[PDB]
Each structure stands twice: as structure tokens, then as C-alpha cells.
Amino acid sequence: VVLADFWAPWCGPCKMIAPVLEELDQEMGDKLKIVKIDVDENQETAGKYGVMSIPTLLVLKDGEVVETSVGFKPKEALQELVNKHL
């Protein structure tokens, strides 16, 4: 189970989600991998997943996208989103 964060350095909401993902890694990092991808430097992956706003959070399970969340989310909402797929 992987939480992929599509972000950019200029995106205000993406700066707000960064500390939330660090707390989530401390609490769940034994069962959840967190991956960050900068859409300014990695346009091909952002295009492949159709990600057409940021932050976009993809929950992947064994390489397949099982859930998609757009915009800022608090920690508890991200935990609920990931815990469905653990």
C-alpha cells in the first residue's frame, strides 16, 4: 500500500499537506509507504495518472490505483482513506 503525493514547490496546499504526510509516516510507516513526486519535474507520470490538479493523493495497492483524493486533507481523513486498503 502506497500513498503517492503529486505536488509542486509553488503549490500552497501542497506545502500544507507536507507536515501531515510526515506525521502519517511516523504513525503508519510500517504498513504504508509514502511517495512524493514533483509534477514540475515529472510531467510524464502526472500525465499517465491523469492528475490535473495538486495536491493529488493516489492510494496504490500492488501497482494499481484503488483510491484518489484531490486537494488538502487532514491526517485523520488520510488515515481513513489508507486504512480501507491495508
Partner 1 sequence: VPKWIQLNNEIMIQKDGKFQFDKDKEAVHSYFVDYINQNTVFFHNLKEKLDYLVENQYYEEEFLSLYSFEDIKEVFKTAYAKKFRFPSFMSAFKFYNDYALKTNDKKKILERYEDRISIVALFFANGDTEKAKEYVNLMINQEYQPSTPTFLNAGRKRRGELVSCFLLEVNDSLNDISRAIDISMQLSKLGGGVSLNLSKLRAKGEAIKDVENATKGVVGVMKLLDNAFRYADQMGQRQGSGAAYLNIFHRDINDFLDTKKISADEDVRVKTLSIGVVIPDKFVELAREDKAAYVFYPHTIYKEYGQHMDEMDMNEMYDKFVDNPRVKKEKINPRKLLEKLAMLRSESGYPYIMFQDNVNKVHANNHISKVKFSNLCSEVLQASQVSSYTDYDEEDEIGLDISCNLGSLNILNVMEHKSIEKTVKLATDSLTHVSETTDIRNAPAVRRANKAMKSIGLGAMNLHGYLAQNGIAYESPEARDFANTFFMMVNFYSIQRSAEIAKEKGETFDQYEGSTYATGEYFDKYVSTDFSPKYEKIANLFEGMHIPTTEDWKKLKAFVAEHGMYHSYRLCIAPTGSISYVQSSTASVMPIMERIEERTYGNSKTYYPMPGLASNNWFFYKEAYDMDMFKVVDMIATIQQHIDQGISFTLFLKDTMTTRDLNRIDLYAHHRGIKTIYYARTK
Q: Is 14 a catalytic residue?
A: yes
Q: Is 61 a catalytic residue?
A: no
- For the chain, where are the E strands, in sequence order? 2-7, 33-38, 56-61, 64-70
As given in the structure block, the three cell numbers for residue 80 are 481513513
CB of 27 to partner 1, least distance (A): 29
68 binds partner 1 (CB under 8 A): yes
Integer CA distances (angstroms), 80 to 33, 75, 83, 86, in order: 15, 9, 5, 10
8 binds partner 1 (CB under 8 A): yes
19 binds partner 1 (CB under 8 A): no
10 binds partner 1 (CB under 8 A): yes
